[PDB]
C-alpha cells in the first residue's frame with residue numbers, strides 16, 4: 624500500500640530487495656521483504672536504525688505490520704562496477720579511496736560491537752559522488768551462498784568469531800579490485816579452506832596458536848607451503864601488499880583492526896576520485 628515497487632534489485636539470505644517509491648513522499652528506497660516475526664529480531668533490528676555513518680547504508684524504517692526493511696537506495700554495486708572496469712581496471716587512487724571509506728565504515732560499526740559477517744562486492748554500494756557504503760551490517764546477528772570472502776576461523780568452526788572476520792572479507796575484496804579476479808573462489812567449504820591454504824600456507828600452531836584445537840580442524844589437512852606474496856596481487860606496490868598481508872593474517876588476534884588499517888602508510892596519499900558511472 625505505502626510503496627510502489629519499481630523493480631527487483633537483489634536477493635539476500637533474508638529476503639528479496641526491490642527498488643520502490645514511497646507513495647506519500649515520493650522518496651526512492653530499497654525495500655527488503657524479510658522471508659518468514661521473532662521478538663529478539665525485532666529488538667535487534669530496531670537498534671540498527673541507530674547505527675548511522677556516511678559509509679553505512681541507512682536503515683530508514685523497520686515496518687512490522689500484519690517485516691519489511693526500508694533502506695537508502697544507491698544506484699550500483701561494486702560487482703557491477705568491477706565488471707564494467709575489467710578492461711582497464713579500477714584506477715589505484717579509486718581502489719584506495721574505496722578501501723579507506725570501507726575501513727571507516729567498519730571502524731565505526733566495530734566500535735559499536737556490530738559485525739557484518741558477510742561482506743561481498745554485492746553488499747558494497749556506490750554513488751556518482753565517489754562514495755561507497757556497506758549494506759547489511761548487523762542483519763546476520765539480528766536474524767540468525769558465496770564462500771569466497773569467508774574468514775578461515777568461520778570455516779574452521781569457531782562459534783564466537785570477532786570483528787576480524789570483516790577485515791578478512793575486505794582484504795579479499797581489496798585483492799579482487801586490484802587483480803580483477805576473485806582471490807579465493809571456492810565452491811564448497813573445504814574447497815574454500817584449501818584454496819586459502821594453497822596460497823597462504825596451511826596454518827599451524829606457529830602462525831596461529833590454537834588452530835589445531837578448532838572444531839573442524841583435521842590433522843589430515845594437506846600441508847601446503849605459503850606462496851611468495853608478490854605472486855598474489857601483482858602489480859600492487861609494497862605499501863598495498865603490506866596492508867593486505869596484515870588483513871589476511873590467519874590469527875584473528877594478529878589481524879589488523881579497521882582503525883589501525885586507516886593509519887597504514889598505504890593511505891599516505893589517499894584522495895577521493897569520482898568514478899564515471901554508467902547508469
Ligand SMILES: CC(C)(O)Cn1cc(-c2nc(NC3CCN(S(=O)(=O)C4CC4)CC3)ncc2C(F)(F)F)cn1
Pocket residue numbers: 632633634635636640653654655680694695696697698699700701703704745746748758759
Ligand atoms: C546483496 C544484499 C544481500 O545486500 C541485498 N541487497 C541489498 C541491495 C540494495 N541495492 C541497492 N541498489 C541496487 C544495487 C545494485 N545495483 S546494480 O549493480 O545495478 C545490479 C546488481 C546488478 C542495482 C541497484 N540499494 C540499496 C540496497 C540495500 F539498501 F538494500 F542494501 C541489493 N541487494
